């Protein structure tokens, strides 16, 4: 996260770290959506142009973390993966369309003050909150600058951007399965996700029921926190039918 701040303890209890077993390193962010299911970006697991193709036994999920590098004894919980599910129409060839994946844990994780699932949006919540100008929150342990790494989880609030502005900012083909967020040059304030924040959640707090909903997944961008560029996020609600199908069949 660029131009963000340190998270508060327990501020993002659904934040998940995807952790590579060998060598031991951060792979991506992700989010906890139930006691057995974790949501992330497909490109965190599969990206052939970079020779990336992780299998279940390659990875661990670390939940309840704050410190990036420390083993947070008696606080974090570490889970093994039972199975990965990548969206069958994930477009890694072109533009990361449908950049979404689920991971089922071998065993249910125990909820605590530091570990708790985020909600997924219904159609109405999405319609009401996914509007240009409305701000969401992105969190992660990714890079602090485009070209170091944070001691603890970082947070930044960013406004959703009008679709035509998103489209005009890039040469990449944008789809209905993505949205973009970030400040415009004229707005003065800044902030963005970056490398390492991939797969982490873009969340909004519903003013109707005061619950946090995950509207987006950190997906792609051109550099980080560049003037006139915006971060792109997987549109979680648009892909919710796939999410439910996977959980219904394999849960």
């Amino acid at each position: 996260i660029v131009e963000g701040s340190d998270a508060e303890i327990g501020m993002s209890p659904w934040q998940v770290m995807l952790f590579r077993k060998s060598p031991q390193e951060l792979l991506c962010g992700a989010s906890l959506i139930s006691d057995r299911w974790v949501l992330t970006a497909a490109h965190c697991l599969l990206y052939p142009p970079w020779d990336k193709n992780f299998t279940e036994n390659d990875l661990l999920v670390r939940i309840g973390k704050h410190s990036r590098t420390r083993y947070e004894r008696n606080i974090e919980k570490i889970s093994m993966l039972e199975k990965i599910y990548i969206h069958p129409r994930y477009n890694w060839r072109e533009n990361l369309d449908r950049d979404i994946a689920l991971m089922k844990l071998k065993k249910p994780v125990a909820f605590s003050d530091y570990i708790h699932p985020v909600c997924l949006p219904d159609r109405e919540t999405a319609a009401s909150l996914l509007q240009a100008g409305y701000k969401g929150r992105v969190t992660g342990w990714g890079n602090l600058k485009e070209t170091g790494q944070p001691s603890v989880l970082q947070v930044v609030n960013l406004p959703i951007v009008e679709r035509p502005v998103c489209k005009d900012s890039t040469r990449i083909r944008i789809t209905d399965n993505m949205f973009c967020a970030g400040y415009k040059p004229d707005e003065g304030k800044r902030g963005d996700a970056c490398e390492g924040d991939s797969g982490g959640p873009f969340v909004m707090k519903s003013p109707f029921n005061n619950r946090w909903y995950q509207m987006g997944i950190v997906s792609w961008g051109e550099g980080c926190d560049r003037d006139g560029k915006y971060g792109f996020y997987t549109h979680v609600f648009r892909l919710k039918k796939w999410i439910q199908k996977v959980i219904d069949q394999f849960g």
Binding site: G10, M11, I33, H116, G133, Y134
Partner: peptide, 28 residues
């Protein structure tokens, strides 16, 4: 599930984090 999106150290205790108000203020 039924308790999704309610943080033990914030919503559950009626405490607000330092910047959530920024979000609420944007929901115009």
């Amino acid at each position: 599930e039924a308790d999704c999106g309610l943080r033990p150290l914030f919503e559950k205790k009626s405490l607000e984090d330092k910047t959530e108000r920024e979000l609420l203020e944007s929901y115009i």
